[PDB]
Swiss-Prot record:
Signal peptide (UniProt feature, chain positions): none
Induction per the UniProt record: In response to low temperature.
Disruption phenotype: A double cshB-cspB disruption mutant cannot be made.
Residue ranges of domain CSD in the record: 4-63
General function of this protein: Binds to the pentamer sequences ATTGG and CCAAT with highest affinity in single-stranded DNA, and also to other sequences. Has greater affinity for ATTGG than CCAAT. Can act as transcriptional activator of cold shock genes by recognizing putative ATTGG-box elements present in promoter regions of genes induced under cold shock conditions.
Keyword Cytoplasm: yes
Protein's UniProt name: Cold shock protein CspB
Taxonomic superkingdom: Bacteria
Source organism of the structure: Bacillus subtilis (strain 168)
PANTHER family per record: COLD SHOCK DOMAIN CONTAINING PROTEINS
Amino acid sequence: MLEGKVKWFNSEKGFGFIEVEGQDDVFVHFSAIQGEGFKTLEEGQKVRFEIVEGNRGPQAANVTKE
Ligand SMILES: [Mg+2]
């Protein structure tokens, strides 16, 4: 699992990007977020994730804060 910070995340629309130094920013959709409760992220929040890539291009998967 990679380590990133949430660059930004629009909490009402449910998407944003994850920073990871030395690499491109990674799109994160609300559906990638793990855990219980309301699926969202805040700015500057550290995360653990995977980059999955099919024919649509790379995005985040298995995003956990803690
Ligand atoms: Mg990948």
